[PDB]
């Protein structure tokens, strides 16, 4: 016999070395695609900075200071002069966490709170 065990056997050994070559093409494809995921996420990150660019076009946002919380979920907030804008802040943030007589982060037009500030 001695071919499928020996001649096609070493042909299969050469196929195993070809699997080593596809382990080289394999791991090159791995690390080059991880580099590709890095550039995708970084260029995607400055693309998300272009998503922030509309909030750059917002001219920034103001500084709210709540002095009194109102029970109708419409919080009076002391603003910079010609302010005192009573408003419901954003729905993802509860009202009771916002403690009165403390400074917060407020958008300049939509008047939704971001966070409590020290």
């Amino acid at each position: 016999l001695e071919e499928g065990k020996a001649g096609s056997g070493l042909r299969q050994y050469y196929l195993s070395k070809i699997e080593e070559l596809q382990l080289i093409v394999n791991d090159k494809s791995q690390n080059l695609r991880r580099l590709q995921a890095q550039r995708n996420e970084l260029n995607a990150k400055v693309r998300l900075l272009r998503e922030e660019l509309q909030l750059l076009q917002e001219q920034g946002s103001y500084v709210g200071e709540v002095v009194r919380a109102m029970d109708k979920k419409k919080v009076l907030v002391k603003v910079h002069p010609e302010g005192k804008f009573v408003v419901d802040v954003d729905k993802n943030i509860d009202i009771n966490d916002v403690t009165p007589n403390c400074r917060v982060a407020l958008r300049n037009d939509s008047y939704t709170l971001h966070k409590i500030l020290p």
């Binding site: 660019l53 509309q54 076009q57 917002e58 958008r107 037009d109 939509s110 939704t112």
Partner: protein, 287 residues
């Protein structure tokens, strides 16, 4: 009782007329007319757009001089322009792209003839030079308030139409007052004429002209920028002199937003202008 899904075709003709008109977008209200042809219900194409002389009243139905309007229109008709008006546009600088009561009322009067009656606001004043975001706006019918608001089919492009998402104007004023999507068209004569026009706007005349200039500014000017390049390099190397102690202590977490690498890659890329232009000198010296 029917409404469809319309989409506005915008050429560069109308666009640069609104950009010359946006350079003519000084603080005062300005006036212009959009023209073209309506081929069906749910597609609309603009070609012809001109501007109008200002008045102290500003944008008004009284500002529209109808014999001057139709006079210029007929002078376009004796030229190669047999197109009806497709809408009227203007600029709203500073206070945002939305439309006042005068705007909605002269819109209400100018939509009696054309059922589509496109209204466009160009505002390059607070628009940056990075993006030229412009939108075409629409009037809803007041008797459609009982039913659902906009029975527009094919809701794919509305994901692109939520790009106007400023948190006061669009949905702050979106009731009784909606908008329409904008796509473009560019044929190959515009594409290659404008393309080689712009590449030529970045290239030279005979194009071999400014080459040897910077090849020989590598010998006159850029040598100073090469020494200063070595000064920023060595001026970082005095910082990286201290770094292997830090890397020889902590190795956990990163505290410096300064990277020291990609800047110096860029310094090498600027330094390779010498190498790339040396062979250019070899070609000029050859023949």
């Amino acid at each position: 009782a029917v409404d469809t899904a319309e989409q506005v075709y915008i050429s560069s003709l109308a666009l640069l007329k609104m950009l010359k008109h946006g350079r003519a977008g000084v603080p005062m209200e300005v006036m212009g007319l959009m023209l073209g042809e309506f081929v069906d219900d749910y597609t609309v194409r603009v070609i012809d757009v001109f501007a109008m002389p200002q008045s102290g009243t500003g944008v008004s139905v009284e500002a529209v001089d109808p014999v001057f309007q139709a006079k210029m229109l007929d002078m376009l008709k004796q030229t190669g322009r047999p197109e009806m008006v497709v809408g009227w546009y203007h600029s709203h600088p500073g206070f945002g792209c939305w439309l006042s009561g005068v705007d909605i009322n002269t819109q209400q009067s100018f939509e009696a003839l054309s059922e589509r009656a496109v209204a466009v606001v160009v505002d390059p004043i607070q628009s940056v030079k990075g993006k030229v975001v412009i939108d075409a706006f629409r009037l809803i019918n007041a008797n459609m308030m009982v039913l659902g608001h906009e029975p527009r089919q094919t809701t794919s492009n509305l994901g692109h139409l939520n790009k106007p998402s400023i948190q006061a104007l669009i949905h702050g004023l979106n009731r009784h007052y909606y908008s329409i999507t904008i796509n473009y068209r560019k044929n190959e004569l515009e594409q290659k004429m404008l393309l080689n026009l712009h590449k030529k706007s970045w290239m030279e005349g005979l194009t071999l002209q400014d080459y040897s200039e910077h090849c020989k500014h590598n010998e006159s000017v850029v040598k100073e920028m090469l020494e200063l390049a070595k000064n920023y390099n060595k001026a970082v190397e005095e910082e990286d002199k201290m770094t292997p102690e830090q890397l020889a202590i902590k190795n956990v977490g990163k505290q410096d937003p300064k990277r020291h690498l990609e800047e110096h890659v860029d310094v090498l890329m600027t330094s390779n202008i010498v190498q790339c232009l040396a062979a250019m000198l070899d070609t000029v010296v050859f023949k």
